């Protein structure tokens, strides 16, 4: 893939994280607390789940980033629309405004409804996520193997500003306490 020239900045926008998630000074890594992190409650944080969106919002054009997801066990990536439900239990669904993949239990799935096996050979420590908004295009690579094409889901229909989208995932193992990271240009 030749997306790399679409490179944007993202950092993350603390005011939706969940009230467990630490989110670092500069604003590019997060992980889950072993607590309430001493925060207010607002409408939008993810009350149920340790998600947070980025701070940018998308409308148009290409836009391209990168993901750290080293030694994790469980998380989910990708992009949503800005209005999606923040309260609550839902499932990960281009239906509910995300298009999203994940590891959970040793597998790695497309978050379609229902969802889909992805197939991976090489275990990716960092992941490119690659928006074509007009083209209603989100594609995933596997920065660890040479970029190598994850997922593609096309005829998207957004219906909104997007956002950046992150789960670190829940730490029932103690395995699972490592940060997600967006990755320098
Ligand atoms: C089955 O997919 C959908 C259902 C509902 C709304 C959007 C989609 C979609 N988006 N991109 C591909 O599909």
């Known amino acids: 893939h030749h997306h790399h020239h679409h490179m944007v900045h993202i950092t993350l926008d603390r005011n939706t994280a969940n009230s467990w998630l630490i989110i670092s000074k500069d604003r ?3 992980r889950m607390g072993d607590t309430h992190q001493n925060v207010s409650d607002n409408k939008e944080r993810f009350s149920n789940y340790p998600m947070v969106l980025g701070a940018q919002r998308f409308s148009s054009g290409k836009m391209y980033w990168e993901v750290d997801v080293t ?3 469980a998380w989910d990536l990708g992009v949503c629309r800005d209005s999606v439900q923040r309260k609550g239990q839902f499932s990960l669904s281009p239906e509910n405004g995300f298009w999203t993949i ?6 790695y799935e497309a978050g379609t409804s229902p969802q889909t096996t992805l197939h991976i050979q090489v275990p990716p420590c960092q992941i490119g996520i690659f ?3 007009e083209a209603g295009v989100v594609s995933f690579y596997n920065i660890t193997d040479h ?3 994850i997922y593609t889901f096309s005829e998207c229909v957004f219906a909104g500003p997007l956002r950046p989208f ?3 995932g829940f730490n029932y193992s103690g ?3 490592a940060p997600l990271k967006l ?3």
């Open 175 to 177: 395995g699972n306490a």
């Open 28 to 30: 590019r890594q997060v």
């Open 166 to 168: 992150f789960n670190v």
């Open 147 to 149: 970029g190598s094409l």
């Open 102 to 107: 994940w590891l959970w239990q040793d597998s």
């Open 71 to 73: 030694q994790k066990e």
């Open 183 to 185: 990755c320098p240009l």
């Open 131 to 133: 928006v074509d908004y």
